[PDB]
Write a protein that binds this ligand. Structure first.
Ligand SMILES: [N+]
Ligand SMILES: [N+]
Ligand SMILES: [N+]
Lengths: 38, 22, 38, 22, 38, 22
């Protein structure tokens, strides 16, 4: 039960990392595209 | 990202206390 | 048992985030190197 | 990354249903 | 018990991904700022 | 990052053996 709560909290952490990774990927791609267009 | 930093710390602390109670 | 399956699915999620992070790190480094070489 | 996006959504949905069954 | 140990190991993995993401975000921002300043 | 790569592999292997023992 505390074990399940752990896993739920871990799942929130994971969704936070997913958010982060997607933000970074968009930003790196924007920079690659800027360099290409220059 | 400041809000992210804080959600990370919050869920990390919550997880570590739950692991301890287990 | 559903608890174990949860953890297994979470483990797949984590490996997906690792893949993502490694892809990003290679790409950012390539951009840093490009800027340095310019 | 389109394939990544989809694997993420698939395992996220699978996890949330398992957490519910538990 | 092995289940708890799993979750603990998963938690170490997650903290490693957090470290990675924060490193990347600082580096991408430094590059965006460099491009802006040029 | 070489040290990161190795910690990742270590905890991944440790997790997969624990999932097996469970
Ligand atoms: N592209
Ligand atoms: N380097
Ligand atoms: N900024």
């Amino acid at each position: 039960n505390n074990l399940l709560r752990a896993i739920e909290a871990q799942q929130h952490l994971l969704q936070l990392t997913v958010w982060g990774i997607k933000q970074l990927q968009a930003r790196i791609l924007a920079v690659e595209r800027y360099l290409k267009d220059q | 990202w400041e809000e992210w930093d804080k959600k990370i710390e919050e869920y990390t602390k919550k997880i570590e206390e739950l692991i301890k109670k287990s």
